[PDB]
Amino acid sequence: SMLRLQKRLASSVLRCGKVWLDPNETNEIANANSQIRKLIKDGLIIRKPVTVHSRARCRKNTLARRKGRHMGIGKRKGTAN
Amino acid sequence: NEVVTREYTINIHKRIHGVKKRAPRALKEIRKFAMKEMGTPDVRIDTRLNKAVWAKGIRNVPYRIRVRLSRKRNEDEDSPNKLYTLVTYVPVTTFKNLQTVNVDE
Amino acid sequence: HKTFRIKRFLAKKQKQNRPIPQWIRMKTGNKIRYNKRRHWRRTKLGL
RNA sequence: AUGUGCUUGGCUGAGGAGCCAAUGGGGCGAAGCUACCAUCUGUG
RNA sequence: CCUCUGGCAUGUUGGAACAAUGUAGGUAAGGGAAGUCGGCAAGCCGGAUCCGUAACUUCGGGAUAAGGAUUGGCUCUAAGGGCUGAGCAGCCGACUUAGAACUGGUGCGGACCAGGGGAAUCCGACUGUUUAAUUAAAACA
RNA sequence: UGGAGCCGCCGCAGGUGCAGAUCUUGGUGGUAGUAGCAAAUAUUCAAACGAGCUUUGAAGGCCGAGUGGAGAAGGGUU
RNA sequence: AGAGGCGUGAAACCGUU
Numbered sequence: 001s002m003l004r005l006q007k008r009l010a011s012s013v014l015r016c017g018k019v020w021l022d023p024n025e026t027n028e029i030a031n032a033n034s035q036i037r038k039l040i041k042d043g044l045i046i047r048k049p050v051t052v053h054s055r056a057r058c059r060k061n062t063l064a065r066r067k068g069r070h071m072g073i074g075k076r077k078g079t080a081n
Numbered sequence: 082n083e084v085v086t087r088e089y090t091i092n093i094h095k096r097i098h099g100v101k102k103r104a105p106r107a108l109k110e111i112r113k114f115a116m117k118e119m120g121t122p123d124v125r126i127d128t129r130l131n132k133a134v135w136a137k138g139i140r141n142v143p144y145r146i147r148v149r150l151s152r153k154r155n156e157d158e159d160s161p162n163k164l165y166t167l168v169t170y171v172p173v174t175t176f177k178n179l180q181t182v183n184v185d186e
Numbered sequence: 187h188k189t190f191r192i193k194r195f196l197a198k199k200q201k202q203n204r205p206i207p208q209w210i211r212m213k214t215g216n217k218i219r220y221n222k223r224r225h226w227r228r229t230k231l232g233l
Numbered sequence: 234a235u236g237u238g239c240u241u242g243g244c245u246g247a248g249g250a251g252c253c254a255a256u257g258g259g260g261c262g263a264a265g266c267u268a269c270c271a272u273c274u275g276u277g
Numbered sequence: 278c279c280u281c282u283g284g285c286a287u288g289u290u291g292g293a294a295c296a297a298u299g300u301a302g303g304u305a306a307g308g309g310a311a312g313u314c315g316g317c318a319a320g321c322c323g324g325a326u327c328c329g330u331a332a333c334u335u336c337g338g339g340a341u342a343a344g345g346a347u348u349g350g351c352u353c354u355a356a357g358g359g360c361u362g363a364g365c366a367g368c369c370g371a372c373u374u375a376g377a378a379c380u381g382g383u384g385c386g387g388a389c390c391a392g393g394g395g396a397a398u399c400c401g402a403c404u405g406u407u408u409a410a411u412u413a414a415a416a417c418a
Numbered sequence: 419u420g421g422a423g424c425c426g427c428c429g430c431a432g433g434u435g436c437a438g439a440u441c442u443u444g445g446u447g448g449u450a451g452u453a454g455c456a457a458a459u460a461u462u463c464a465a466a467c468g469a470g471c472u473u474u475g476a477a478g479g480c481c482g483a484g485u486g487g488a489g490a491a492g493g494g495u496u
Numbered sequence: 497a498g499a500g501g502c503g504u505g506a507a508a509c510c511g512u513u
């Protein structure tokens with residue numbers, strides 16, 4: 001049924017926000033009112049990875065601007081000073 | 082036999098024309114299509130198919146979808162309907178010259 | 187940040203926010219049927 | 234037709250493919266609707 | 278404006294349809310204020326770089342006056358520093374500026390952001406304040 | 419139908435008779451199953467519990483000087 | 497209880513026959 005307490009405890013223990021409760025072990029969870037650590041150890045509740053925000057595009061253009069690109073008259077918004 | 086499984090192409094493009102509701106409308110129209118084809122009002126959409134429909138957001142739904150309608154016996158539940166239709170997603174490289182075919186299983 | 191007097195006032199107001207005991211409904215000359223109940227949002231304390 | 238090109242910023246590791254920016258912007262544009270902005274009709 | 282960490286479920290409901298009238302946005306051939314009390318609102322301008330800038334003036338300004346050109350992508354050239362033994366050799370290092378060639382169905386501040394301008398009259402010098410809830414003004418200071 | 423008091427005649431007494439007072443208090447209509455439940459982009463699939471928008475998982479989105487994390491005043495157990 | 501946590505029980509208004 002309702003797993004708000006279990007998810008809140010899992011977030012506090014895991015030090016994350018990112019909490020994944022196993023959709024199939026819904027009865028082995030929900031009786032972990034305190035035990036969340038034991039459920040973490042055996043993998044019933046896991047910490048999901050960070051959603052990817054890559055800087056590959058930023059690094060590639062930074063290299064392009066190092067060579068001197070996107071720095072013409074049509075790309076400047078501030079004054080020279 | 083009522084445990085047939087068949088494979089269809091749905092023109093999502095024409096079922097949603099002139100309509101923030103295009104993907105919900107796609108789901109509704111796919112369910113309506115399955116109900117019309119298999120007669121069973123109990124239609125269950127596979128989550129992979131729902132993911133395929135929402136692949137480009139609510140606004141830009143793919144024009145065509147290749148789906149599989151499987152009419153199942155429903156021996157698990159005691160619901161008044163004694164048959165349901167599971168709808169599954171079939172990824173295809175192209176839609177050209179694709180016919181409705183029965184699949185043997 | 188509370189004073190001792192304010193906190194004691196609040197404690198007394200808390201101990202008064204309970205329903206009547208049910209057995210009082212069985213007394214010989216009882217006219218009460220329920221409790222002067224106060225809700226923190228509906229009615230505000232005299233402060 | 235959000236049809237097909239082009240394009241800015243960002244995002245999916247890159248590409249192929251795309252999405253977000255309360256319709257991103259712009260070109261051309263089916264159908265339908267529509268203009269004395271009709272080379273249609275108006276009487277014994 | 279887009280994203281990550283974190284957060285949320287669209288703000289007292291949902292479904293079908295897409296008539297009028299409305300509220301909020303977009304476009305419109307030719308004309309271009311003929312509309313209206315009045316260009317109301319809304320549309321023109323808008324960023325940077327390089328040129329250029331009048332009357333008048335309290336000489337400070339006016340002034341981004343006005344007006345013109347340019348702006349993408351890609352490949353280069355030149356210049357701009359620190360450590361080693363009027364000038365020679367290595368290792369390290371962050372970003373700019375300028376000048377070119379090539380290249381696009383002339384498109385390039387491609388979204389976002391972002392001053393319309395000029396010639397005058399009246400009043401108040403200016404900045405500031407003011408009738409909370411119809412008057413921001415020439416009123417008050 | 420109601421369940422505990424009441425009336426005639428001779429006198430006496432009065433806070434003694436309502437349709438109005440934008441009367442006072444209380445109750446109830448038509449309006450009317452009507453106006454309406456339209457500010458801040460957006461929801462979908464599957465499963466679980468259950469007599470019958472909640473929870474879990476997966477998608478798609480939004481906040482992006484925050485719709486994040488903490489306090490002061492106020493509240494007083496929320 | 498045609499007294500059901502309530503004596504009698506009018507009118508306005510409503511349902512039904």
